[PDB]
């Protein structure tokens, strides 16, 4: 309050430069401030949520504004296969002359928007720049609304009471109904009123959306339940997305499968889809009691699930108490569920490409998947990091008297021993088989390889109709129960998309699928060995049982008792962030090298040269970095010269991380003394004396900043290589 | 004071020149009311001279260099191209060494002489710093807004500065 | 398309905003 950390007086008394860094990194740590109690905490995170949401909508209004103003959006609408989607323009004063010829696309010098945004705005039904301006203003207004609320609920009499925050009971009555159920219903109110007619040629802007019904007859003879009229005449075959030719007029037809032409999902399928998800979520909103009293008390829902089998402790009696009073448990479930949702998003954006003329630009599809996978891994590691924060700064094993959680801390030894077992097994049985296949391929003999057919994935693709394997089971067999059971409904529009080898749906599978998917499960089980380790040994280990007393990110225990480098629950974060970047590494190298074989066409280039490691370092890193690393030559440059620069730049980020990760503090803490000796002793600079005393970075910060350069270097290197690689082999 | 719904005791002062009691968004809080005053005076005087250029865009005083009468748009670009627009930043810099003498925006504002007016540029000197100050600011404020009304007349009308007033409407 | 606006906003937010914002945050350490 006096100086800097206007929030912690334990850091304002510090004369060093640690008051700055810990003043920054403990700013959002609202549970550890001067005198901020519970009401003063929820009444601050609730306002900062609004500030956050307004930052999100300021950002999306940013994309709407630059696409509205510097992009080539409607020219892209004219030819979505040919013209590249432009991002915002450039103003460098550093582009001398030869750079500008490598960026001119029309009058603009803009970047090429490799983020899939024109596809989604083209399936929404935005066919102009004018709607992008009205939308951008429509989100500047919304960000002003959210900043108004966060400023407004920190105004004192509008700061809501904590009993309102502990209406945990009824947020689920309103999120599942209002946020999820209504809005998705409202999103059908977009798709029925905008995306279906502006895909079927009818420009239904903001004028005739009440005078032109999306079905030619609607809602006066349609409370009678004659709902097959809304799925009467589908858009069958002979249609191009955007015009009115070859298209019917039904709204909610569930054909299943793709377009024949744009290789995306039907918008009738999405209108019916979000409509059904909307109805089911609105039904799920009627789940819990309120002031009315028709629902479920959550205490009666966790208290009742104590098994009389008796194996599962004294049941969940104690769990509802440690979700209301806790937050890091609730944030751990939030990041867990959001993270599995992101990985589901990533595993479906390529597999079932939703957006017209995606899977035709092979860079934006390659960036959306990798984007949501690295964000997926970040949010899992957040779920376990706040898991360990829950077990340290939030866990009460007296309200959790022999609870399910206390049972978890009881058998955490068996948990960590068996995670370490499966991780060891997969690490001797991916690396064993890749070094086997790589030695054997190296010794003039690709035949003596171990290739195991991944028959379980091939059988599961046979359960979804991929007839290219010869199992002839539930959907691959055309005479079975499920094959007849949806023979009219959605099968023949969908098995065409399955049995095709053009689309990225249910890919053809060699033993690279086997060896890589074991490598992925190695990554998941190592990363949960670490995270579940320093989330269950977050509280106390047999090295030091004092760990719960020191908080989350305490540095160490000194050299005592053998040495104690990185014992904290923050280490599990600190190490499983490397395993996060690694595991999402192998996921996206595998995906990206699978689709550089599909999109090129030579699937045999993958399946012959991916079962061993020089297949990866040869056929994928050495070959596909060739149009990258030719980004600028001593003969000139091209448009990839940004990424080939960034690539190199990112290596310089990555290895600077090692300077903090490898080489720890007491080197630098006795080197800053040489620098401060030399600054104090010299003339003409001893006048300019510091105020904060120069001190080397503390060993939680140092491992953290080395981790941050490891992430930024890693992710910028691979975002350089995805985009420069696919943008070099194509576009 | 002045604005009727009781929203008028901010950091400002009623005896300040140009006062008519109007800060709804309480910009007088946090923004150094004297510096906001000096920015209002200086914006009013330079917008005042600028709309005087948009008043004396008639045939008088075209001395041998321009030959481009009544353009008001890319005339700025015409003298970015013609040069010597950098040079008038040099000359104005040679003024603003002498005028304010502290010349840093919020750090160390030169408040010595009771009024945001520097060195007493007044060779005629028939009025002193009387309530003429009170009628300077309005003659800046109106000189601000209609100045925009000239340039927006160049923006979307784009026709002519002076040729809106007689019977000329879109 | 007001093409001149990045020639104003990209310098005045790219360089002079992390000059005066260094001043506001760094004096704001001592306020």
């Amino acid at each position: 309050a006096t100086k800097f950390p206007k929030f912690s007086q334990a850091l304002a008394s510090d004369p060093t430069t640690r008051r700055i860094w810990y003043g920054i990194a403990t700013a959002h740590d609202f549970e550890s401030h001067d005198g901020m109690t519970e009401e003063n905490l929820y009444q601050k995170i609730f306002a900062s949520h609004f500030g956050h949401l307004a930052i999100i909508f300021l950002w999306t209004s940013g994309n709407l504004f630059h696409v509205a103003w510097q992009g080539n959006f409607e020219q892209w609408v004219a030819n979505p296969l040919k013209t590249k989607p432009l991002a915002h323009a450039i103003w460098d004063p550093h582009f001398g002359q030869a750079a500008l010829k490598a960026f001119t696309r029309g009058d603009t010098v803009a970047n090429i928007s490799y983020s899939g945004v024109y596809h989604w705005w083209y399936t929404i039904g935005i066919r102009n720049n004018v709607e992008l301006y009205t939308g951008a203003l429509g989100l500047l207004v919304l960000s002003a609304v959210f900043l108004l609320a966060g400023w407004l609920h920190i105004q004192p009499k509008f700061k809501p009471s904590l009993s309102w925050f502990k209406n945990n009971e009824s947020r689920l009555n309103h999120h599942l109904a209002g946020l999820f159920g209504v809005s998705s219903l409202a999103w059908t109110g977009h798709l029925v009123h905008v995306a279906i007619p502006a895909s079927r040629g009818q420009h239904v802007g903001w004028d005739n959306f009440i005078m032109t019904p999306p079905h030619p007859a609607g809602l006066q003879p349609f409370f009678t339940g004659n709902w097959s009229v809304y799925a009467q005449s589908p858009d069958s075959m002979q249609h191009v997305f955007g015009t009115s030719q070859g298209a019917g007029t039904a709204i909610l037809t569930f054909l299943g499968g793709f377009h024949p032409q744009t290789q995306s999902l039907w918008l009738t399928d999405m209108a019916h889809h979000h409509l059904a998800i909307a109805v089911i979520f609105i039904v799920a909103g009627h789940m819990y009691r309120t002031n009315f009293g028709i629902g479920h008390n959550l205490k009666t829902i966790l208290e009742a699930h104590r098994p009389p089998s008796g194996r599962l402790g004294k049941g969940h009696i104690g769990i509802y108490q440690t979700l209301t009073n806790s937050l890091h448990f609730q944030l751990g479930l939030a990041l867990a569920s959001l993270s599995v949702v992101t990985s589901l998003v990533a595993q479906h954006m390529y597999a079932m490409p939703p957006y017209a003329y995606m899977a035709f630009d092979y860079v934006t599809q390659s960036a959306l998947y990798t984007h949501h996978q690295y964000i997926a891994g970040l949010l899992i590691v957040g779920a376990f990091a706040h898991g360990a924060i829950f077990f340290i700064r939030d866990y009460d094993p007296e309200q959790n008297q022999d609870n399910v959680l206390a049972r978890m801390l009881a058998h955490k030894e068996a948990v960590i021993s068996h995670l370490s077992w499966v991780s060891l097994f997969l690490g001797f049985h991916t690396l064993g088989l890749y070094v086997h296949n790589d030695v054997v391929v190296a010794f003039g003999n690709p035949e003596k390889q171990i290739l195991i057919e991944p028959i379980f994935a091939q059988w599961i693709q046979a359960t979804s109709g991929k007839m290219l394997y010869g199992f002839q089971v539930l959907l691959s067999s055309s005479t079975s129960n499920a094959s007849v059971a949806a023979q009219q409904l959605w099968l023949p529009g969908w098995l065409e998309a399955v049995n095709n080898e053009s689309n990225s749906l249910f890919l053809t599978i060699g033993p690279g699928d086997f060896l890589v998917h074991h490598a992925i499960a190695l990554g998941l089980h190592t990363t949960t060995l670490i995270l579940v380790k320093g989330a269950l040994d977050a509280r106390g280990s047999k090295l030091m049982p004092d760990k719960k007393d020191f908080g989350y990110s305490f540095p160490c225990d000194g050299p005592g008792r053998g040495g104690t480098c990185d014992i904290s629950a923050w280490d599990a974060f600190y190490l499983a962030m490397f395993w996060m970047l690694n595991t999402i590494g192998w996921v996206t190298f595998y995906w990206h090298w699978k689709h550089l074989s599909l999109w090129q066409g030579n699937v045999a280039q993958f399946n012959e040269s991916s079962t061993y490691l020089m297949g990866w370092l040869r056929d994928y890193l050495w070959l596909n970095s060739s149009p990258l690393i030719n980004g600028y030559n001593p003969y000139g440059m091209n448009s990839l010269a940004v990424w080939s620069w960034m690539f190199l730049f990112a290596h310089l980020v990555w290895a600077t991380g090692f300077m903090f990760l490898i080489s720890w503090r007491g080197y630098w803490q006795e080197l800053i003394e040489t620098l401060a000796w030399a600054h104090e002793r010299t003339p003409l600079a001893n006048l300019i004396r510091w105020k904060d005393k120069p001190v080397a970075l503390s060993i939680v910060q140092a491992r953290l900043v080395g981790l941050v350069h490891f992430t930024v270097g890693y992710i910028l290197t691979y975002a350089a290589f995805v985009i420069a690689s696919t943008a070099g082999k194509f576009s | 004071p002045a604005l009727p719904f009781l929203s008028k005791p901010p950091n400002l002062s009623p005896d300040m020149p140009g006062y008519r009691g109007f800060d709804p968004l309480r910009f007088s809080d946090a923004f150094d009311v004297n510096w906001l005053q000096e920015g209002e005076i200086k914006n009013g005087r330079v917008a005042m001279l600028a709309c005087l250029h948009f008043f004396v865009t008639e045939f008088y005083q075209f001395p041998f260099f321009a030959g481009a009468p009544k353009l008001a748009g890319p005339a700025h670009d015409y003298f970015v191209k013609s040069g010597a627009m950098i040079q008038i930043l040099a000359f104005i810099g040679f003024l603003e060494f002498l005028l304010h003498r502290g010349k840093v925006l919020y750090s160390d504002m030169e408040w010595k002489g009771r009024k945001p007016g520097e060195l007493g540029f007044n060779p005629l000197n028939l009025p002193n710093d009387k309530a003429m100050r009170d009628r300077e600011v309005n003659n800046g404020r109106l000189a601000m807004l209609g100045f925009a009304g000239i340039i927006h007349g160049e923006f979307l009308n784009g026709k002519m500065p002076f040729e809106q007033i007689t019977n000329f409407q879109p | 398309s007001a093409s001149y606006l990045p020639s104003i906003l990209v310098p005045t937010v790219g360089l002079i905003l992390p000059f005066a914002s260094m001043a506001i945050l760094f004096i704001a350490i001592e306020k």
Partner: peptide, 27 residues
Amino acid sequence: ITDNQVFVALIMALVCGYLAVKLAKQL
């Protein structure tokens, strides 16, 4: 595609900037 809507845009996010500093100097 025009210029005046860009001015209206930076007006609305300038006001939104005033709500950003307005929220920022209370928490």
